Structure formats: structure tokens, C-alpha cells
Symmetry: D2
Subunit: 177 residues, 4 copies
Amino acid sequence: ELYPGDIKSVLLTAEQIQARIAELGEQIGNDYRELSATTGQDLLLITVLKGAVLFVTDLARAIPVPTQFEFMAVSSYGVVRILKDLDRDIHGRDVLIVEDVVDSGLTLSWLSRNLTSRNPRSLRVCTLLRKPDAVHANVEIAYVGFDIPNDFVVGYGLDYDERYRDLSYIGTLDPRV
Amino acid sequence: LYPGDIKSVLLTAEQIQARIAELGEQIGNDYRATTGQDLLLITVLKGAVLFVTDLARAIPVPTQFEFMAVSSYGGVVRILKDLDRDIHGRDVLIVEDVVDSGLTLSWLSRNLTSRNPRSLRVCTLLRKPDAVHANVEIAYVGFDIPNDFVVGYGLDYDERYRDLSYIGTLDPRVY
Amino acid sequence: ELYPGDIKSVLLTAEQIQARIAELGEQIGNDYRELSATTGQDLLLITVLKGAVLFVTDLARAIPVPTQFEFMAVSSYGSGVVRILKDLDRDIHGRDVLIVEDVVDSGLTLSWLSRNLTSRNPRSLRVCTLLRKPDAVHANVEIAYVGFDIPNDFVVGYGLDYDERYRDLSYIGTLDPRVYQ
Amino acid sequence: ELYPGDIKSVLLTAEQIQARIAELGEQIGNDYRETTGQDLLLITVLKGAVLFVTDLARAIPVPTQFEFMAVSSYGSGVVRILKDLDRDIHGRDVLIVEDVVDSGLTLSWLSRNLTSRNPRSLRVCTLLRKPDAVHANVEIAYVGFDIPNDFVVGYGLDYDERYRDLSYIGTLDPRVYQ
Ligand SMILES: O=c1[nH]cnc2c1ncn2[C@@H]1CNC[C@@H]1OCP(=O)(O)O
Ligand SMILES: O=c1[nH]cnc2c1ncn2[C@@H]1CNC[C@@H]1OCP(=O)(O)O
Ligand SMILES: O=c1[nH]cnc2c1ncn2[C@@H]1CNC[C@@H]1OCP(=O)(O)O
Ligand SMILES: O=c1[nH]cnc2c1ncn2[C@@H]1CNC[C@@H]1OCP(=O)(O)O
Ligand SMILES: [Mg+2]
Ligand SMILES: [Mg+2]
Ligand SMILES: [Mg+2]
Ligand SMILES: [Mg+2]
Ligand SMILES: [Mg+2]
Ligand SMILES: [Mg+2]
Ligand SMILES: [Mg+2]
Ligand SMILES: [Mg+2]
């Protein structure tokens, strides 16, 4: 065990995650199958740094169609500041936003509006985890991995002060941390 | 995924994960309470994002993530995205996908050491024969491969073939 | 001289520039003097690197109301389609913002910048350019403050450049074709 | 008056500021007039020294170019790069243009960072210098003024992103930065 005592409870084991991603990729693959030959360009996965890097690497390999990578680095104004923009113009591209968790959905709403103004051919959202407050915002999420309670969790990219990211499983963090 | 593009398979997906399992265990034993700070993996976007996610899960000690985005001018690169936190007194492990000319690695090494980390080592999945010409000490190497252009497992040709679980050799007709 | 054999003719002398900016300053000052003390926040000047840098410095010192500085570094993906190299430092939400440009011709980047800043929901958004080319006279992006209506000549000076040169010129002149060939 | 009751006193008027910059410009020009074919490269860190660099470049008789860097802070010369140079300064004559040097920790980093890019020549020009920078480890060949340790604003200098547009440099009243 990496963090003894810090993990209060195990929410999603590594077995659950990889199995869900396996069938998530198949679903995404089935939907974007008539686009690798109907258009001419591969599915574009856009990921916000950095908690969703573990998920996007497993997902891209789980999707049975060719996929490309694009990353974004953002920070909150203390509406978010762009620390690192995309490398390519996503005009006429099939873009799939890949998130790790959607709670308030504020940044997701911003990102959705920001990418759509770049005029993609298509634009959908895929997240590994969805929290109850994501009902209050509504950005249409076509691909949801898991619906979980409103408890702070870590593991599989998810963090608390840049820690617990390297966990293969997703568990609930102990409040004493 | 890419019918007719891949000529042959250099490293299968099973062999990659098996070696990464070895690397993590090796890295884990070397970096294993005194500091009170976790191991810090610094990765240059974006061909080594697949390798660092598997490696970090293969390392039996707590590891953190830091990413950098760079671009070429025109040995010297442009920082498009710097680190999020100060690596002062931190055990930094640079994670690369492949080292060939090693000019960017040389630049990155000098750049990070000026930030004064506690330690600084380099781990790469692949190493090409002309890495000897680059004066950068690499503590952890996954595979020594020929100079032939390869794709897969993060490696790309015009932003493609990154999603391949294996590392294959591209057909020169494509390149 | 600084660039002999390069500058063919002076389109706008140094004197004509300082005289027009002073006039622009008071005009902007009067229009924003109300909202200045009413909202309690200063006028926000947003400038895109790096041509309009010289212009925004002289302009802000010409406006008789307190003005703040803000910069944004951008790049082109391909030919408007714009990549952000350096985003703004603070929130634009609920701020009186005046876009400060050096010159507008195609207006592609300006159209992008306008649409982008409006998404941040400013209290007010207007554009001020030092120079305007014929193809930008009847654009969709409204510009309330135009310094000069210059012809379609490729000009350098006062921030303007060709291959990162002639920026330091105190005046604006028509560059010789022998240079940009 | 832009700010009626905020400026305690005027340290440097607009007249004596532009007079010094004119002197600096000629001094820089006569030094860099001496063959390479490449112009003098001015490097400025946002945002304070953006007013000084525009006036200085127009005060320097030799052709000068513009390069800008934007930096932030981690904790702290520990520093983050938000906007790197968009040009390679290899074998270039680089002059760092600063607004004020106090602790000089940022300047120390900027020196080490730029020198690793291997410029032809690297020098520093600052408009203002505070007592704890007079005998700093980084050499500054061009100093406009040596001012006291008092917190000043104006001519690019700021407090909470204000007072930058002032044509003069004045001392802020303790009421403001309390
Ligand atoms: O349980 C968590 N573990 C790790 N990180 C979490 C958790 N819940 C929220 N987050 C983070 C907090 N900042 C982004 C992310 O929230 C998603 P959103 O922008 O839709 O509110
Ligand atoms: O076989 C390859 N497949 C995919 N990418 C490759 C390959 N060989 C080189 N590269 C890239 C080329 N640019 C960075 C990287 O080279 C490593 P270095 O910076 O040490 O020279
Ligand atoms: O006469 C010129 N001198 C110096 N630069 C010029 C000139 N005309 C255009 N430009 C540039 C071209 N790219 C940005 C700037 O024009 C603004 P826009 O995006 O509206 O075309
Ligand atoms: O009197 C001032 N008015 C406005 N800004 C000031 C003043 N003194 C310092 N500064 C700023 C504070 N951050 C950078 C600069 O300090 C100089 P350094 O980083 O070399 O110690
Ligand atoms: Mg996320
Ligand atoms: Mg987080
Ligand atoms: Mg790499
Ligand atoms: Mg590549
Ligand atoms: Mg402009
Ligand atoms: Mg230009
Ligand atoms: Mg400064
Ligand atoms: Mg300041």
C-alpha cells in the first residue's frame, strides 16, 4: 500500500475502472466509426491537465478507432486563465472532451463554449466520474464512466494537493488529511 | 487501426508493460520517508504521457506529476508551459519516451538543475544509438532500439499512431 | 538616420501622431469619465503583443482618467484562428474594457479577440486602433476610436514592423519594396 | 490629477525622467554602435517596464528590437515562465530593460536564464535602483536613478495594478498599501 491510513474507503477498484473504460471505448468507437472514412481525420481527444491524463491514456487505447491527443493547461482567476492552449486548429475536427470528474461543471461549461467557437465538426464530452452537483449545470455528457456520491475522492489522476494521483484505484480520502 | 501503415512490430504491448514493471520496481527500490516528499516525475508533452502514466503506477513509491510543453525555435527550445510548482529540494525524475539527439534532454537537464532539486535523474523508455553523442547521464533505460523511425505508445508521425498499445515500425511509404 | 535606404516616405510624421493621440485621449476620457467614478473601477486597456505596445503607452498617458494595463500574446495556427500564448492576468468580468490595437486590416484577429473577450462578460467592450486600412473601414467589429485612415500601403514604424524591425521608429513610414521582397 | 489624495509626494517629475532617458539612450547608443549586422535586442519583463522600454528605445540612436517575457511566482529567484521569448537570442546583443531593482532575485534568475541561451552580449538597464541593489551580484551598466527604499508608483510602477499610467513617479501614501 502506498498511502496507509489516508484511504478511508475504496470506491472503485482498478478492475472496475479498466472494465468500464473497455466498454466505454467500444461505445465511443461504435459512434465514431463512420467518421474515420466518412471524413478523413481521426477522432480528437482534448484533455485538461492534469488529473485526466491517466484516464485519457487508457481510454485512447480502449477506443477501437484511431485517436489523437491534445492537452490544455488552465488556472482559475483568483472563467479560467489559459496557461497552455491547443497545438492544432480543431476546425472541422471531431472533438471529444475527456475529463476525469464533473462536479460543478463550471470549467466544463467554459471549455465547451471555448472549443465550439473554434468551429469543430462535432463536439461531445466524456468523463470518468460524475458527481451529483453536475445536474445543476447542464453540459450534455454523452459518455459517463461512473456516477458517484458527493464525497471527495482520490486516485487514478485525482488528487489532494498533488498527491494520490498514482493510485490504480479510486478511493475516498480520509478527512484527517 | 492503421492497416498497411505498420511494417512490423518492434515491441509488443505485453513486452512494454513487462519492462515498465521492471523499471518501476527498480526505480522504487532506489527512491525508497527521509524527505517527507513524494518522488516527482517531470514529463515533456506529449509523446511520453502514456509512458509516464503506466510507469507511475508501476513504481511502488508515491509519485507526483508535472508536465512541460515546449516548442522549437525557428539545443534550444521555447517554454510554452512551465512547471506548476517549485522543485527546490525535490527528488526529480525526468521521464522521456525516446532519446536520440538528446538536445532537448540536455537543455531540460540544465534548466531543472538551475531550479536546484535535491536529486535529478533521467528515465526513458527508448534509446537510440546516437544518445551516446549526447552528454547526459541516463539512469533508467527501457529498451535500446535502432535508429529506425518508430511509432506507437505515445510516439507519433504527424500526431498519429500515438494510441497504439505497441511500438511498431512505420512503412516508409507513409513517411 | 536609423534605417537609411529603407524608409522611402513618411506617411505620418512623429508630430502628427502625438497630436492625434492627445485628441483621442481626451475623447476616450470624456466618454469614460462617467463610469470611472460611478463603478469605482479604472478603465481597462487590453493590448495584443507586441506592435501596439508603443501606442498603448502613449495613449494611456493621454487619457485624462486612470487607466490600467493588460497584455495578451497570441499566435496563428494557420492563417481568425488564433492561438493564445499568454492569456490575460485578471478577470474581465464586469470591467470597462477598451481594446487597443496598432492597425486593423483584415480584422480577423480583431474579430476573434472581440468574440473572446465578450465571452468573459465585460461591463463594456470597445476598440481603439491607431491605424485603419481600407478593408477594415466597413468591418463588423465596431471601432469607436480610429486614429488614422491610411491607404493599403505596407507601413512600418511606431510599433509596426517587418521581420521584427523598424519598431523603434518614432514615426510611421512606407517601407520600400526592396526590403520586403 | 488622476489620483487626488493617494500620492504623498512627487519623487521624480516627468521632465527629469525623460531627461535621464535621453542621456541613457545616447550612452547605450554610443556603446552599441560598435559589425554584426544585427540590431540591439531589448528584453522587458511585463508589465511595469513597458513604459520605460518604449521611451528608451525611441531615445536610443541605434536600431533596437523588442522582446517581452511574462513571469509569475512560485513562492520565492524562484520564478515561473508564463510567456517565454518568441525568438532565439543566440549570438545576439541583449539588453535587459528593467523598471526597478530591489532584492534583485528576479534579475539574478533572468541573468542566468538568458545567459544559458548564449547571447553575444548581455547587459542590464534599469530606470530605478533601490539601496539593497546598489551592490548586487548582477552588474547593471545602466542605472537611471538611485532612489530610497520608499515604495513608489507611477511610470509603469504599480500597486494592485494601478497608478501605472502616471507620467511621473511618486511616493504612495501608507493609507493605500496598509
Ligand atoms: O473528489 C475529487 N477529487 C479530486 N478532484 C476533485 C474532486 N471533486 C472535484 N474535484 C476537482 C476540483 N477542481 C476540478 C475538479 O472538479 C471538477 P468540476 O470543475 O466540474 O467542479
Ligand atoms: O522513432 C521516433 N518516433 C517518434 N519520434 C521520434 C522518433 N525518433 C525521434 N523522435 C522525436 C523527434 N523529435 C523528438 C524525438 O526525438 C528524441 P531527441 O530529442 O532525443 O532527438
Ligand atoms: O502596413 C502594415 N504594417 C505592419 N503590419 C501590418 C501592416 N498591415 C497589416 N499588418 C499586420 C499583418 N498581421 C497583423 C497586422 O494587421 C492586423 P490584421 O490582423 O487586421 O490584418
Ligand atoms: O517601490 C516599488 N513600486 C512598485 N514595485 C516595486 C517597488 N519595489 C519593488 N517593486 C517590485 C515588487 N516586485 C518586483 C519589484 O521588485 C524589484 P526586485 O524583484 O528586483 O526585488
Ligand atoms: Mg479534469
Ligand atoms: Mg486537483
Ligand atoms: Mg518524449
Ligand atoms: Mg512527436
Ligand atoms: Mg495589433
Ligand atoms: Mg508585425
Ligand atoms: Mg521589472
Ligand atoms: Mg507590480
